Structures are given as structure tokens and as C-alpha cells.
Amino acid sequence: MSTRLKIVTIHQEPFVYVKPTMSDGTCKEEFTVNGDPVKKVICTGPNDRHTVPQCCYGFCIDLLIKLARTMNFTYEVHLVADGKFGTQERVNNSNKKEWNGMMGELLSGQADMIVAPLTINNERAQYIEFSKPFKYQGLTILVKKGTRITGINDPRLRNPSDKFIYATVKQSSVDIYFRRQVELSTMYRHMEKHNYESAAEAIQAVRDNKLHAFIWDSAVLEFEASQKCDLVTTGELFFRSGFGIGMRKDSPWKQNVSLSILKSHENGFMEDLDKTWVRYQECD
Amino acid sequence: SDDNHLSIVTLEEAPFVIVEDIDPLTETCVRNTVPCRKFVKINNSTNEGMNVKKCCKGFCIDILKKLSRTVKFTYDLYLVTNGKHGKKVNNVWNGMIGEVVYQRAVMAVGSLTINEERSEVVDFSVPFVETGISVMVSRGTQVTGLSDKKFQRPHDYSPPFRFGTVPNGSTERNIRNNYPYMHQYMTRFNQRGVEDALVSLKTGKLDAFIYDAAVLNYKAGRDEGCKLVTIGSGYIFATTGYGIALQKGSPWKRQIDLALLQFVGDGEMEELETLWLTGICHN
Ligand SMILES: C[C@H](N[C@@H](c1cccc2nc(O)c(O)nc12)P(=O)(O)O)c1ccc(Br)cc1
């Protein structure tokens, strides 16, 4: 075993924050609102196409540090080069299909482990190994406060027109979800015209009334609505899914990664992380 | 048969696994049930017993039927008779876990919780039902979840909460390990079982009941008057799920994982939840 893993992650608050280094190349010392030291790692990545050291922290970085300490491995973290989570796409109308995003980097060896809010699904599980879920959540819908839709069955979603724009993030698990089912083909035909490069851009477009509904992970959307009281979620969860650590099928770490996640759910470590990063007050 | 015909163990626990008598005139299981064998004891102070043909149905039985069809195996289903889900006694496992560990069953299908201890000796499928340690109260009572300081430090509040669980299982063991004061405080409010706890809540003798999320959601969905409610799912503690237990290194695990994930992605799991678990109380 090399024992030094290439970790790939992705910007995705509150799971992964990405901030510039200080002038001297280190990460500013910070504490959370509840007084815990914020553990920061150097993560190289694009920032606009050169790669530059940046500072990463959040729920997923805390989990990475717990895993590395428990199993005694070392690591280097980078941000996924294309900025995507990962879907499988046909190559140049060939026979071959190829994964983009973090999935593609893990399968190619550019990464040895994905530590990110990476959705567990059949499509990805065919090719990589997932841990047991480190977070249980689902899909919901973000709108500007004052926008009235019932949820995923609303006629403005099920009978789409250019008068009500809705979308998700390109090359993500939610993209897969709507492309998977022929029943959803009309919805997908609309979203494919409007899907955004990243969650943060889609969320800003909702605030700016350029995107009318954003379909995405509830653990992210409920957090965003908790900070930005002009945004709300609607419809509860219309689908339930979990996040897992991603590894190639030959990883020597996969059994102990899952055991550590299970131990951490059962002893309140995951509760601490959820309270620190994920949970928040309702607006009023 | 041979390697495609699998010994499978389960455990009666409605609505996940429901056990019925077989028709004595026909001795055939019909409707949505499948045959399941039970070793029924002769009396309470004996190891003697006799196998009885029963019929089994429920949420987990329909999962088993789908896996049987999709993964292409047949099975001989039996009900565990020594223990329940799985406990280690004197370094020996009983319950459903024991049947798998000691190679009497290829898989265990039931309301069997994925945890760290069991995962050292069996392999678990992906979770097929979400659960965890949750809280039920009468509508109007205000708490967040197990880690609420109204539970951790009840004497900071007036009057102090009365709250309990069903003792001697995984819930008490978890609270004992994680929250020593809470654990010793709640022993006075131990409930003999779920049904007793619901009555205690409804009649004002108990303020909160801490127990399995899936069980509590099911009971809340069916409550007369829809007055018993659970906490929000974001506040479930030690989130996990029910999963299928297989022997370490099982050749069936990959196929079973992919099949369960396909069922989830195609909505088939949602259909089963609506069929078996979702109740009239919608909030
Ligand atoms: C909430 C659950 N424990 C209860 C429970 C209720 C319903 C179904 C159950 N299935 C199991 O396999 C299991 O161990 N426990 C189940 P109980 O053992 O206290 O009655 C529980 C709490 C912490 C962890 Br660790 C595991 C289970």
C-alpha cells in the first residue's frame, strides 16, 4: 500500500468550503460559532486554467480527518478539475462511455477516494464502491419566497413552458435521476436547456429571478434557505438518498471506512458534525 | 436448487414481517404471502420443539420477493427462534445475525439494523429502509431529537421531562454508552413495549418515547386522531437503516446491493412504503 491517498472533493457548502490561502500560503486560523477549531486542509484546484493551493474545510473535511486518523493514512486533497460530481456520457458517438467529474477522476486514478456529498445510486455503484451512508437526505426544490408551487408534481413542472424555468446541476446525480425514467422525459427536455454548471450558480440565479426552481440535495438547499431568507424550499422530499465515500473496487480501505462511518453515527460524532455544519434555525 | 436455493432467516415484526397460520385444509400459502417455517417450542422450559408451516407477508417479504425475481434465486424462509435481531452473549451471536454468522442462513431479511458491531462479523447490503434513534411525543410537546438538552440535562427545565424507551435492546445500549446521565434518569420511565409506550404518551403519563425511527413513523401514521407525532427526520440520531445481512464475503452481496439501489431509483421502494408503511396521518 502507498498509504498516501489522493482525495478529490468539490466546492459545496456546508459540506466543503473553499477559501483563498493567506499571503504566506497557510490557512487562517478560525473557530466555529460554537467554539470548535476549524480544521483546514490545503486543497489544490482551479479558481477561475492554472491550479492554485486553496483552503478547504467543512463537514466532509472533518470526516476525511477522522477517517485518516482512524485508519492511519496520509492524504493530499484537490478539487475536481471539471467542477462536476459525475455522470456517464457516450464518447464521440463511439461504443465507449466515460465518467466525468469526481467519478471520472476516481476511475482514472487521478483520485483514490472521493470525499464529498456524493450521492449513492445504482449507476455509480456498478463501477465504484460506496461506503455506508455518512449522511441521509433527499431531493427537494428551492424557489424564491413568494413563488407558489406544490412540489415535483406541480403543473408548472410537469407541463413545462419557457414561462417557468427550472433546472438542476449538469453532470450530477439529479441529472441522472431525471434522465433515468422515460416518465420524466418531458421534464428532462426542459431542464437540459437550463441546467447550471454548479449549485452555487443555480442558487444565485434563483435569488436573481433568472431561475424559478432549483431541484437539488435537501442537505444543501435547506442550509441555503436557512442563511438566505429570500429563498425557501417547497414540497418536502420527493426522493430519499444518501451520501457515501467513493472508492475504487480494489481499495484496501473500504471495509474500515464503512466501519468508521457506522461507529461515528453510533457515538455522536456524526451528530456533532451535523450540528456544526448542516443544521440551522428556521427564518422568521 | 443447490447453490441457487438459499436458506434465509427472518423475524416476526409487523409491518415488516407478519406471520400467519397456514390453511390446515390446503397447507398452501396464498395471496401475497410466502411459506415460512417456524420451530415452535413444546413448552417454556425446554429445547424441544417442532417445525410448523406458516405464511409470511409484509414490507420485507415483498423486498425478498423482488430480490428473488431480480437476482434469480429461490429460498427456504424460516423464522429465528433463539433471540431476535442479534446479540453477542459469551462471544456467541444469537438472533438473525447468529444464523448468518454460523452459516445456517445465507441472508437475513427483516427489520435488522446495520451497525458497527454486526458489520465486523457479517456483510450488510445497502440500507433498504432509513431509520435511527428518533423521538415520539404528543402533538404540542416541543423537543428536537435525542441530543436536545431537555433530554441530556432534564433538570435544567421545569417541570423535568418524563421520557423513556423499551429497555434491554439496542436503544438502551446506545443511550447508556453516549449519555450516561440521560440513561440513568430514564430507567424510571422504562416502557414494557411499544404499545404500552403509546398509551403512556396518549394518557399524559409520559412526555416522550425514544425508539426506532421506522417503528415510530409507522405508529405515528396510524394513530387514532393523529395526535402522536415524531421529530423531523433531520434530527434522527445515529441515522442508519435496516439492511440485509449476508455472510462475510458472500457471492450474493453485489447483486443484492445493485438490485436494492435499482428498486430505490425506479420508485419500487416508494411503492412498497406506500403499500405497507405510510398511514392516514400525513403530518
Ligand atoms: C432503535 C434500535 N433499537 C431497537 C430496535 C427497534 C426496531 C428494530 C430493531 N432492529 C435491530 O436490529 C435492533 O438492534 N434494534 C431495533 P431495540 O433493540 O432497542 O428494541 C437501534 C438503536 C441503536 C442501534 Br446501534 C441499533 C438499533
Residue B238 near residue B111 (C-beta atoms within 8 A): no
How distant, in Å, are the alpha carbons of A54, A55, A58, A94 from that of A40? 10, 6, 8, 43
Residue B161 near residue B154 (C-beta atoms within 8 A): yes
CATH number assigned to the domain with residue range A137-244, chosen from the 4 options 1.10.3720.10, 3.40.50.2300, 3.40.190.10, 3.20.20.70 = 3.40.190.10
How many other C-beta atoms lie within 10 A of the C-beta of residue A173?
24
Q: Position of cell 433498504?
A: B128
The answer to whether the CB of B170 is under 6 A from ligand 1 is yes
Q: What is the DSSP letter of B233?
A: G
Specify the residue with its C-alpha closest to ligand 1, atom 1.
Answer: B212
Strand-strand pairing, B5-10 and B107-108? parallel
List chain B residues with CB under 8 Å of A280: none
Amino acid, single-letter form, for residue A88:
Q
Residue A245 near residue A257 (C-beta atoms within 8 A): yes
| Terminal-residue alpha carbon distance, chain A | 53
How distant, in Å, are the alpha carbons of A15, A153, B54 from that of A158? 31, 6, 46
**CA–CA separation, B99 vs B93, rounded Å?**
8
Q: Given this chain, do its domains B1-131+239-277 and B132-238 carry the same CATH topology?
A: yes
- Of ligand 1's listed atoms, the one at least distance from the Cα of B112 is 12
Sheet hosting strand A246-247, strand order edge to edge: A17-20, A51-57, A41-46, A74-79, A4-9, A113-114, A246-247, A129-130
| Cβ contact B147–A240 (<8 Å) | no
How distant, in Å, are the alpha carbons of A24, A26, A34 from that of A29? 13, 9, 15
Domain range annotation of chain B = 1-131+239-277, 132-238
CATH class given for the domain over B1-131+239-277: alpha beta
- Residue A119 assigned to a binding site: yes
Sheet hosting strand B5-10, strand order edge to edge: B18-21, B49-57, B34-41, B74-79, B5-10, B107-108, B245-247, B122-124
B160-194: buried (b, 16+ CB within 10 Å) or exposed (e) per residue?
Answer: ebbbbbbeeebbbbbbeebbeebbebbeebebeeb
List chain A residues with CB under 8 Å of B127: 132-133, 242
CA–CA–CA angle A19, A25, A27 (5° rounding):
45
List chain B residues with CB under 8 Å of A267: 177-178
Helix (H) or strand (E) holding B74, with range, is strand B74-79
CATH class given for the domain over A1-136+245-284: alpha beta
Q: What is the DSSP letter of B3?
A: G
- Residue A53 assigned to a binding site: no
**CA–CA separation, B243 vs B251, rounded Å?**
17
Cα B194 to averaged position of ligand 1 atoms, centre (Å):
12
Nearest CA in chain B to A268: B238
Give start-end residues of each CATH 3.40.190.10 domain in chain A: 1-136+245-284, 137-244
Radius of gyration in angstroms for the set of CA atoms belonging to chain B, rounded to a whole number: 20
Q: How is chain B split among helix, strand and coil, in percent rounded to 5?
A: 35, 25, 40
Residue B206 near residue B189 (C-beta atoms within 8 A): yes
How many other C-beta atoms lie within 10 A of the C-beta of residue A253?
20
Residue A16 near residue A60 (C-beta atoms within 8 A): yes
Q: Position of cell 456533532?
A: A272
Q: Position of cell 469526481?
A: A102
**Cis, peptide link before residue B180, omega less than 30° from 0:** no
Q: What is the DSSP letter of A196?
A: B
**CA–CA separation, A98 vs A169, rounded Å?**
18
The answer to whether the CB of B191 is under 6 A from ligand 1 is no
Give the best residue of B116, B231, B253, B283 to mutate against chain A (max A CB count within 10 A): B116
A53 strand-pairing partners: A44
Separation in Å, CA of B244 to nearest CA in chain A: 13
Specify the residue with its C-alpha closest to ligand 1, atom 24.
Answer: B170
**CA–CA separation, A143 vs A205, rounded Å?**
10
Say if residue B113 is exposed, middle or buried (CB neighbours under 10 Å; 0-12, 13-18, 19+): buried
B252-271: buried (b, 16+ CB within 10 Å) or exposed (e) per residue?
Answer: bbebbbbbbbbbbbeebbee
Q: Which residues of A touch B (CB under 8 A)?
A: 120-123, 125-126, 130, 132-133, 135-136, 177, 180-181, 222, 240-242, 258-259, 262-263, 265-268, 270-271, 274-275, 278-279
CATH number assigned to the domain with residue range B132-238, chosen from the 4 options 3.30.70.20, 3.40.50.10300, 3.40.50.620, 3.40.190.10 = 3.40.190.10
